[PDB]
Design a protein around this ligand. Structure first.
Ligand SMILES: [Mg+2]
Ligand SMILES: [Mg+2]
Ligand SMILES: [Mg+2]
Ligand SMILES: [Mg+2]
Ligand SMILES: [Mg+2]
Ligand SMILES: [Mg+2]
Ligand SMILES: [Mg+2]
Ligand SMILES: [Mg+2]
Ligand SMILES: [Mg+2]
Ligand SMILES: [Mg+2]
Ligand SMILES: [Mg+2]
Ligand SMILES: [Mg+2]
Ligand SMILES: [Mg+2]
Ligand SMILES: [Mg+2]
Ligand SMILES: [Mg+2]
Ligand SMILES: [Mg+2]
Ligand SMILES: [Mg+2]
Ligand SMILES: [Mg+2]
Ligand SMILES: [Mg+2]
Ligand SMILES: [Mg+2]
Ligand SMILES: [Mg+2]
Ligand SMILES: [Mg+2]
Ligand SMILES: [Mg+2]
Ligand SMILES: [Mg+2]
Ligand SMILES: [Mg+2]
Ligand SMILES: [Mg+2]
Ligand SMILES: [Mg+2]
Ligand SMILES: [Mg+2]
Ligand SMILES: [Mg+2]
Ligand SMILES: [Mg+2]
Ligand SMILES: [Mg+2]
Ligand SMILES: [Mg+2]
Ligand SMILES: [Mg+2]
Ligand SMILES: [Mg+2]
Ligand SMILES: [Mg+2]
Ligand SMILES: [Mg+2]
Ligand SMILES: [Mg+2]
Ligand SMILES: [Mg+2]
Ligand SMILES: [Mg+2]
Ligand SMILES: [Mg+2]
Ligand SMILES: [Mg+2]
Ligand SMILES: [Mg+2]
Ligand SMILES: [Mg+2]
Ligand SMILES: [Mg+2]
Ligand SMILES: [Mg+2]
Ligand SMILES: [Mg+2]
Ligand SMILES: [Mg+2]
Ligand SMILES: [Mg+2]
Ligand SMILES: [Mg+2]
Ligand SMILES: [Mg+2]
Ligand SMILES: [Mg+2]
Ligand SMILES: [Mg+2]
Ligand SMILES: [Mg+2]
Ligand SMILES: [Mg+2]
Ligand SMILES: [Mg+2]
Ligand SMILES: [Mg+2]
Ligand SMILES: [Mg+2]
Ligand SMILES: [Mg+2]
Ligand SMILES: [Mg+2]
Ligand SMILES: [Mg+2]
Ligand SMILES: [Mg+2]
Ligand SMILES: [Mg+2]
Ligand SMILES: [Mg+2]
Ligand SMILES: [Mg+2]
Ligand SMILES: [Mg+2]
Ligand SMILES: [Mg+2]
Ligand SMILES: [Mg+2]
Ligand SMILES: [Mg+2]
Ligand SMILES: [Zn+2]
Lengths: 83, 206, 60, 23
RNA sequence: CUGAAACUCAAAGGAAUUGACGGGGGCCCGCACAAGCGGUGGAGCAUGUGGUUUAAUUCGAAGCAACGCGAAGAACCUUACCAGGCCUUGACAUGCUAGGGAACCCGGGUGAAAGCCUGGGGUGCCCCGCGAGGGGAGCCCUAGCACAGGUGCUGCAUGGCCGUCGUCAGCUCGUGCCGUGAGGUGUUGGGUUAAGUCCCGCAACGAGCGCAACCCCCGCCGUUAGUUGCCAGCGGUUCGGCCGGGCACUCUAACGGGACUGCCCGCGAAAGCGGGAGGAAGGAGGGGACGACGUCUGGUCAGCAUGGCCCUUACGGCCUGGGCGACACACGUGCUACAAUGCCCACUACAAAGCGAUGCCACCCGGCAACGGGGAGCUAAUCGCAAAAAGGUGGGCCCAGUUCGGAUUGGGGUCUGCAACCCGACCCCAUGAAGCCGGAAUCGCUAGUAAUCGCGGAUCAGCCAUGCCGCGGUGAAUAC
RNA sequence: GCGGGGUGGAGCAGCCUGGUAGCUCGUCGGGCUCAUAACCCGAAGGUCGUCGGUUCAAAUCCGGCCCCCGCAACCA
């Protein structure tokens, strides 16, 4: 995984938007292209629109889903089965 | 399409490289690329003169470019003139000691890249492709050559069905390595598309 | 996507990971040898011509 | 074995090292 | 028996020529069959493909001769596909008009980045230059015109390059002769060979492209050379060719020699065939390089070249993200196995070819480990990668879905990289699936081969490599 | 009015004697072939016309309704 000795990665520009809103009190909408990011404790309760290549997917973050990456919650493929 | 390139087949036996110099792993490409940039510029200008062979030598930040040609006068210029104006043009790209010679060609008819280049011209000028080839061979042989073969592929006369026509005289033992084979290729542009010209000259064996 | 790509290939990028080799003679992105700077196709073409110093066919 | 990472023969296959093949 | 027409076709035919084919003949050959040995087809997995799915799952490849193929390295990049945000002489070449100042480096606002908006700072020359000031043009910026640009279509318009039948023994030409002519002749015929190989014969006589030879690797010997390589002898030896000393030997790498049916018996008109000797080598010594005229309207406009057709605020271009990695299924090539001629642990041997200065990294230390911090040597016959592995000695397992097999997943870490969600490799704890030798069918190999074992290299930040190109270890069975 | 019948896609067994659905072709997946057929190897699909009843249990026995085949319907 992301090497523990280094950092816990969040794209600089998005982290700021969360933290700006934290002061003011959250929450508007957050159109992002930050799949490479980590969901991070400051993000809980926000509603983030993640780009899956196609759409901006509305994801409400919870206290349970923190250590993951953002893109795990914006599916890249549409699959309904065969036949 | 099967046959081997008869030049590269003979390297280190009957034919010798046109770039004779050494370099280590970290420098080889940068020099080789210069020969590439140089040979283009040379053949961009010197095509008129009747360019036959581009030899390049190197030591350390210096290079002697020995050019073979059928009209040495058009290369050298007015009293040392054109051959000068290239020296400056040359060391502009090179950035180094550009020693540019010009050497005699003691017969364009024994020069494969020349025999081809001329035929490529004749058919750019709407000439009879069959007849022109038999002539090309007929020149080469009259100059005492041991054997000759000449090939043109493409829309001959503009024909919609592409065709490969060829002609030959004497010997051409392309399987034999102790036999000297000068090979030259010439690409003829036209209005209806491009044709390709192959020439093989058998000088004599070793 | 062609000429803009041989040209995008030389300029120094937005991150150094994105460095990819393009055959300096014809621009082939695939099969590019470090030593010559060429693609396996040009490799063979210059060589056969005898314009590759010290290069000759291997037979063993 | 040759597919079993937790063995000697297994890590020789991959060309790597560990407790199950020390260097 | 006598015997029409309407309608309808652009021919129906005769002989002979060259081919191709024959469940015709003859003579031969190729791991073609047979004789054997190991597989594939079942299983789990890696990879390519068909389908389907998808916003997109870019494109080509299609029976032998498409399918681990272009791809010798898809997270962004690559990348040609799709979504969204953007740029208009334009990411790029060669020209002119005019404006700034030339140039170049540093940061700022905004936004995912691109971009759009911005704040800095000084031009040479040669010149009237103690002075406002002026341009030429090395160059960047800016409003235009040329023109750029297109992996958009056409391999059925093309060059080039390649596959292919086929390493098969063939394909022709000049002249003469024959036939009205296509064409035949030679090239057929006897024999021989790996071969249109050589011999003998002949209205044929020669010539050419092919076969073979010339070139490389290997097997024996020699000359030359002796460090970083080697150590037979002697002497020192901290016990390591480590020092003296030497190039003898192994080797390294250039130049030669040697093999030719040359000698003998014999069968033969001959070319050759069976045998014998000498010799490291014997009848092409083993392997390689090398592929005739042509065939497949074969393959590649996506490596490149190129006619033409097509697009121009876009079929061009820049970016951020996603897709190329999808999954009811089918097929191809593979990897690892189902075990005792085996699995596992400890100790212990013997290769080769390669590779390596933000590269290989001895050695020391932290760590179960991947790795991490130290740090020496080496532009490398010196130093490193490096342990080769199957093997040998000893010990355990005891016929079990197992101490076989290592897929699937849970949990925890290392590294590369801006970034490993989709979508990398590796290490560790736990989980321990299918599979008990594979239906119809089907593949490879004739000897240092098959089978089995490890090592390297290209691409390459890392890597989905079990792929490919090589290298040595051990080493068969069988051909009536 | 009397007798017989309806079972994968087609055509027939199994019902009498209750427990267990079979045969040929066809369909689908694989193989041989350049390819198709044939041929070879595997594999899917009938909840037995319906509704009711007997039974522990009904394709099977009994009733209802439905559709089909055959025969009868004469003195008038
Ligand atoms: Mg025109
Ligand atoms: Mg192009
Ligand atoms: Mg890269
Ligand atoms: Mg590359
Ligand atoms: Mg095991
Ligand atoms: Mg094994
Ligand atoms: Mg009659
Ligand atoms: Mg006839
Ligand atoms: Mg076979
Ligand atoms: Mg057999
Ligand atoms: Mg068998
Ligand atoms: Mg099998
Ligand atoms: Mg399988
Ligand atoms: Mg697909
Ligand atoms: Mg195409
Ligand atoms: Mg076909
Ligand atoms: Mg790859
Ligand atoms: Mg991607
Ligand atoms: Mg992108
Ligand atoms: Mg991109
Ligand atoms: Mg991509
Ligand atoms: Mg073609
Ligand atoms: Mg095509
Ligand atoms: Mg072609
Ligand atoms: Mg004649
Ligand atoms: Mg006649
Ligand atoms: Mg006559
Ligand atoms: Mg004739
Ligand atoms: Mg013949
Ligand atoms: Mg003939
Ligand atoms: Mg004969
Ligand atoms: Mg042969
Ligand atoms: Mg001959
Ligand atoms: Mg004759
Ligand atoms: Mg000596
Ligand atoms: Mg003999
Ligand atoms: Mg040969
Ligand atoms: Mg075609
Ligand atoms: Mg093109
Ligand atoms: Mg074109
Ligand atoms: Mg792909
Ligand atoms: Mg299968
Ligand atoms: Mg595989
Ligand atoms: Mg398989
Ligand atoms: Mg089990
Ligand atoms: Mg990943
Ligand atoms: Mg087990
Ligand atoms: Mg089982
Ligand atoms: Mg057992
Ligand atoms: Mg087995
Ligand atoms: Mg088997
Ligand atoms: Mg059988
Ligand atoms: Mg054989
Ligand atoms: Mg490497
Ligand atoms: Mg690697
Ligand atoms: Mg993978
Ligand atoms: Mg390997
Ligand atoms: Mg029925
Ligand atoms: Mg009955
Ligand atoms: Mg019964
Ligand atoms: Mg079927
Ligand atoms: Mg069939
Ligand atoms: Mg009851
Ligand atoms: Mg029943
Ligand atoms: Mg009932
Ligand atoms: Mg009932
Ligand atoms: Mg009833
Ligand atoms: Mg009746
Ligand atoms: Zn190239």
């Amino acid at each position: 995984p992301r090497s523990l000795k280094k950092g816990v990665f969040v794209d600089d520009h998005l982290l700021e938007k969360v933290l700006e809103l934290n002061a003011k009190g959250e929450k508007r909408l957050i159109k992002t292209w930050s799949r490479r990011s980590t969901i991070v404790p400051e993000m809980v309760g926000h509603t983030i629109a993640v780009y899956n290549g196609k759409q901006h997917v509305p994801v409400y973050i919870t206290e349970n889903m923190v250590g993951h990456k953002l893109g795990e919650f914006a599916p890249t493929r549409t699959y309904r089965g065969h036949g | 399409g099967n046959k081997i390139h008869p030049i590269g087949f003979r390297l280190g036996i009957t034919r010798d490289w046109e770039s004779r110099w050494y370099a280590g792993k970290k420098q080889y490409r940068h020099l080789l690329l210069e020969d590439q940039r140089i040979r283009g510029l040379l053949e961009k200008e010197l095509y008129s003169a009747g360019l036959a062979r581009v030899d390049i030598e190197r030591a350390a930040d210096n290079v002697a470019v020995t050019v073979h040609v059928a009209k040495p006068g058009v290369v050298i210029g007015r009293g040392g003139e054109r051959i000068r104006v290239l020296r400056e043009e040359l060391a502009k790209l090179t950035g180094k000691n550009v020693a540019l010679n010009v050497q005699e060609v003691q017969n364009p008819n024994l020069s494969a890249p020349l025999v081809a280049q001329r035929v490529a011209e004749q058919i750019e000028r709407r000439f009879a492709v069959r007849r022109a080839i038999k002539q090309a061979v007929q020149r080469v042989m009259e100059s005492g050559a041991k054997g000759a073969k000449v090939i043109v592929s493409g829309r001959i006369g503009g024909a919609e069905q592409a065709r490969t026509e060829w002609a030959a005289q004497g010997r051409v033992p392309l399987h034999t390595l102790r036999a000297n084979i000068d090979y030259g290729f010439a690409l003829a542009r036209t209005t209806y598309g491009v044709l390709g010209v192959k020439a093989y000259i058998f000088l004599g064996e070793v | 996507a062609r000429k803009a790509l041989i040209e995008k290939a030389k300029r120094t990028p937005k991150f150094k990971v994105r460095a990819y080799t393009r055959c300096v003679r014809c621009g082939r992105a695939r099969s590019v040898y470090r030593f010559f700077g060429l693609c396996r196709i040009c490799l063979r073409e210059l060589a056969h011509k005898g314009q590759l110093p010290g290069v000759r066919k291997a037979s063993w | 074995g040759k597919g079993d990472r937790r063995t000697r023969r297994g890590k020789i296959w991959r060309g790597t090292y560990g407790k199950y093949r020390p260097r």
